[PDB]
Design a protein around this ligand. Structure first.
Ligand SMILES: COc1ccc(S(=O)(=O)N(CC(C)C)C[C@@H](O)[C@H](Cc2ccccc2)NC(=O)O[C@H]2CO[C@H]3O[C@@H]4OCC[C@@H]4[C@H]32)cc1
Lengths: 99, 99
């Protein structure tokens, strides 16, 4: 894919049979998904943004398909305004920024 | 250039006569800079991120050079933890996400 930025770079993702929308986000170190149920034991964490910090549950080794491409890695779950794919997963996609 | 996402995509910018480091942020609609003065009038604006909303100052049609490219547009100034370059300016560079 080549994704221009006139619109939000929202892609379709597949999380265990659920399809969702998520923002491809180079400004995010990590992937944060809106509150949902994931497998495994989780570490509560603090994650900070524009408007301060929110608490998230960190889950490891979560299979996600982004854009038809399979990735497996860490996903943070909490009160985010939108699902965001962070660099930890965009590197698995092999995303680069180009200009 | 082709920018990798192994590291934060930080670039040097020049705005208001000042050199700054900023994060190239495809998940950011708008460009948001830590508190500084600009030689233009502004209006208040509420901008919402992962922790919620913050009040910013909105300066319109602000020239910025990014990696030696001259761009112009809206710059928001306020209590952001990091300088971020949003889509409003990256579209002017011809920035695409590629994978
Ligand atoms: C270490 O792990 C992390 C740590 C932090 C974050 S983050 O979401 O807070 N963020 C980091 C940055 C502030 C240093 C990534 C950004 O891409 C967020 C991601 C984001 C998007 C939407 C909502 C909340 C967050 N964008 C954002 O806050 O943009 C603001 C400014 O312009 C508007 O575009 C967006 O779209 C409309 C509102 C926002 C506005 C993610 C993973």
């Amino acid at each position: 894919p080549q994704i221009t930025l006139w619109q939000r770079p929202i892609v379709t993702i597949k999380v265990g049979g659920q399809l969702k929308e998520a923002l491809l986000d180079t400004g995010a170190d990590d992937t944060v998904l809106e509150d949902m149920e994931l497998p495994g034991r989780y570490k509560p964490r603090m994650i900070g943004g524009i408007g301060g910090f929110v608490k998230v549950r960190q889950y490891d080794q979560i299979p996600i398909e982004i854009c038809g491409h399979k990735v497996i890695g860490t996903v943070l779950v909490g009160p985010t305004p939108t699902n965001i794919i962070g660099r930890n997963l965009m590197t698995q996609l092999g995303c680069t920024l180009n200009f």
